[PDB]
Major head protein (Klebsiella phage vB_KpM_FBKp24), 621 residues
Amino acid sequence: QRIGREIRLTPRYRYFNFLPIMLVINVINLEEAIAQRTALDVNETQVTPAS
Amino acid sequence: HEFAELFYRTYIVTPDQAGFQLSIRRNLVWEGWTGEGLSGEKQEISKRNILQGLLDYTTLETNSTELIPVIQSGENDEQFIDPSVLPAQTVKQGKDTFDTNFLKFSENGEGFNLLMLAQTPSRLKKGSMTFTDSLDSRIALKQLLISVTKGGTTELFALDVNRDQYAAYTATREYNFRLMQLKFHTSLGLGEESTTVAGAESALLKDLFDLGYRIELDVKVDGEMNVENGNGDTSLRALRLARVFDKEGKEIALTDSRVSAALSGLTVTGVGYSLEARLTNINQLEMGLLIDSDVQKQGFMIPTLPPLVIVKPAMVEDDKTYPRLEALTTAYRIQQMRNNAVTTLLNRADTLKSYLGVGVPHPIESNLGLEGVGQYYVRPYYNEATIDVLNDLNNLTSAAKQTDIQGLIVSKINEMVYTADQLTGYTAALEAAFSGRSPKPHVAIGTDMRLPQYIQINGDDRTVGIGYDYTIARISDLRMKDKIVMTFILPNESEPHPLQHGVLGFIPEYLVDFNMIRNQRIGREIRLTPRYRYFNFLPIMLVINVINLEEAIAQRTALDVNETQVTPAS
């Protein structure tokens, strides 16, 4: 016994998957990388005696 | 002067008003307090802005029809397993809060009356069973609850069986013309990361898992269900471990020593299942997003400011000790146009700092203390950063130091612009506010007189980045030392508007000239009383602090090897 107007939409749709090939990459630390300087990874080779 | 104009849009107010008003429209999505005609009986709750859904993906999600079995405390426990195997699971459906479980497999006995079973507390208010209620063209298995025992320890596994091709009820001939049949005959596999009821990689197949092996169970499940009364049955026919795959899809015999020793004592037995059932409600009973809109109130006022005065003997005019009006006009102009703009900008920065914190956004309409109708269209956001030029500059030769510094600063400022654009959702706000015309963000650049040569283009391929329009503002003030202030503005607009950063409420005023008697002396006076006030709406601004530019240029620094370690002890 409350009287009003109604508007309705009852959708019919669905998502299906066919191709089983898909790749994802996570990207991280971009803003630290652009904020801080990075300079070289040099491999000191032991002409100072260690080998 | 550029600076006041760029950050605070000037506006002329006819002296017949004490300010100006803005009436705003806000479309809303929410549920409860149902209807407006004879509203209430579910009471008022928080509105949600529809634009929030353009960036959030939960406020607009609802289910209002799914038939989830509900445990009545009477005889209803018959169709569910004993709660000593799996406790009830509490789920939300509409406004109802209740309990569900997994139905028990029935071979030859009673069926289950879904319509009798699917009564939620909302329906009980309406008067129980409705004759037009019918089951949708889809009924599919949600989950299969199996028991895996190894040596005596029982572990339950909830297998997500939905979205599977073979797990759909199919229409069939014979018996009636409203019969749906489920013929589920396939092999399901448990991986080496097979999760139990919640988390973990199990503990009875771990020896199988580490070796790199997944098990596969062959299963044939058959059932029938009627879409006219909700009667039906379902029973398991076959359930056993058959095949074990290697790191490839090549069958591994179950007689080899490792797997045979590992698989000893394994038994698999099913106890339950779950169905997703929809009710094509033909006479309709459902309620959904109640779309409403509210109008909001806010008022602006204009104060009075103390005046400037001139004194001179009132017997002859002098241009020597008192110059012409131009000097008084200049004092008024500087006072109103530069110092106050800087004060308002810095106070706005400080208040935004205190209110919001650093590097954290806020949900739409969650900061009621800020000034401005602007927060109706975007999230509030604040940020701060420092650049130590000497410590984080890379050079290769001394001849490129200026270009290096320019590149560093422009990269940092540009990246700050991108992250602000991502978090505040500003562009969507522009698209919503103006239909058909899509403006691109314009960045406000407020900086002192030492930096701009290092920001203007001499190298690089950008000033603030590609896709932005920039205006550089330079002032002689001392407080803006070592500071750059970024903000988004609108240059094609000429009215108060919430996306606008700030407005300069301006009323023209003039002077008075007369003779005044103050302790028995006579001198004509010139008085100018200005009337204005600055207001800010848009709650987004970026400020970057620049320090130590002197030492970096003065003292050489370049590169600085992050060596890599083939040394003792590592």
About this structure: Chain A touches chain B at residues 2-4, 6, 8, 17, 31, 34-46, 50 (CB under 8 Å). The two ends of chain A are 94 Å apart (CA to CA). Residues 3 and 9 of chain A are 20 Å apart (CA to CA).
